[PDB]
């Protein structure tokens, strides 16, 4: 599923991400935009043998288990396949645990490179929430 910008903003708000641990809703929508372009099925194989999964491109070396990644730790205690659903529930649950570490949203490279420091609120403006 490819979310519309405002569609995802509303979904993420319903999923409790607005200001979760200090991160405004705009941060999450912007992260999804540059990480997966709002595509819940997006995957990206990495050089280290891990793969990034879903709307928030959650990594198989640290966060989810895809059974094919060396040194996997499965910090989110969830199979990566669950992060490839049109239902963002599992991705949000894991994203919350990820951001609950001192590194915060810096875990998301695209967010760090294209969102951090910008007017992230613009990503939820002009939307019926």
């Amino acid at each position, epitope marked *: 599923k490819v979310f519309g910008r405002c569609e995802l903003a509303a979904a993420m708000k319903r999923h409790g991400l607005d200001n979760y641990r200090g991160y405004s809703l705009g941060n999450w929508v912007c992260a999804a935009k540059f990480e997966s372009n709002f595509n819940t099925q997006a995957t990206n194989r990495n050089t280290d043998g891990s793969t990034d999964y879903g709307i928030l491109q959650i990594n198989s070396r640290w966060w989810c288990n895809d059974g094919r990644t060396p040194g996997s730790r499965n*910090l989110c205690n969830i199979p990566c396949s669950a992060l490839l659903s049109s239902d963002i529930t599992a991705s949000v*649950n894991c994203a919350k645990k990820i951001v*609950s570490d001192g590194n915060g949203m810096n875990a998301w490279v695209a967010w760090r490179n294209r969102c951090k420091g910008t007017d992230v609120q613009a990503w939820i403006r002009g939307c019926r929430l």
Partner: antibody, heavy 113, light 107 residues
């Protein structure tokens, strides 16, 4: 499967440092975030703090910096150190993972002169 | 910090009947409210996470509802094994905080 178990003294003196150990069996401590929660004599629960994968810690402000949570990957254990305790620190201490799916059995610690 | 207020403080019910427990937050916390059950001489047990998400291994008679500041834990047809304490806990902001608890007992 995962198992958690608290260990340490049950009787401590006021002003001393209370130290508890949580032994994790079934998986590496590097595979989760680890927490400490305690229950006061009157059904009052307090989330003391947790340590995440990067080593960053989060402590309850109520503990006024008397708390320290550390880990030992080689022994697959993590710890709780609470300095300068008072009778207010008498409670049942539990270790559990951040998700709250795994909990230890809890251990009563009484602070008394 | 975020204060969670639970009501009633105590609830007496006859097995077979249904009950609903309330937990209200001092400020909006989205869906970041979890429910725990705790019995004498035992560690807390997670029943519902993120307001309404089910937990594997928990009886289906337990359900959660709510968002923002008002949440509820419902037990459809209470069983004797359900008597004990129930606590809500929020994870929206650090420090995580617990409600004062609701005691469910047989009447």
């Amino acid at each position: 499967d995962v198992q958690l178990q608290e260990s340490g003294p049950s009787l401590v003196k006021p002003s001393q440092t209370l130290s508890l150990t949580c032994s994790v069996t079934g998986d590496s401590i590097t595979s989760d975030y680890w927490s400490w929660i305690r229950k006061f004599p009157g059904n009052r629960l307090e989330y003391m703090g947790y340590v995440s994968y990067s080593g960053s810690t989060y402590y309850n402000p109520s503990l006024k910096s008397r708390i320290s949570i550390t880990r030992d990957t080689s022994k697959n254990q993590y710890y709780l150190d609470l300095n300068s305790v008072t009778t207010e620190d008498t409670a049942t201490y539990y270790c559990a993972n951040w998700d709250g799916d795994y909990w230890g059995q809890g251990t009563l610690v009484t602070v008394s002169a | 910090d975020i204060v969670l207020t639970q009501s009633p403080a105590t609830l007496s019910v006859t097995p077979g009947n249904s009950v609903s427990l309330s937990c209200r937050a001092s400020q909006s916390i989205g869906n970041n409210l979890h429910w725990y059950q705790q019995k004498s001489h035992e560690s807390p047990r997670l029943l519902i996470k993120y307001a309404s998400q089910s937990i594997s291994g928990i009886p289906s008679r337990f359900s959660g509802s709510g968002s923002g500041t008002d949440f509820t834990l419902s037990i459809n047809s209470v069983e004797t094994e359900d008597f004990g304490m129930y606590f809500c806990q929020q994870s929206d902001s650090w420090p995580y905080t617990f409600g004062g608890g609701t005691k469910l007992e047989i009447k």
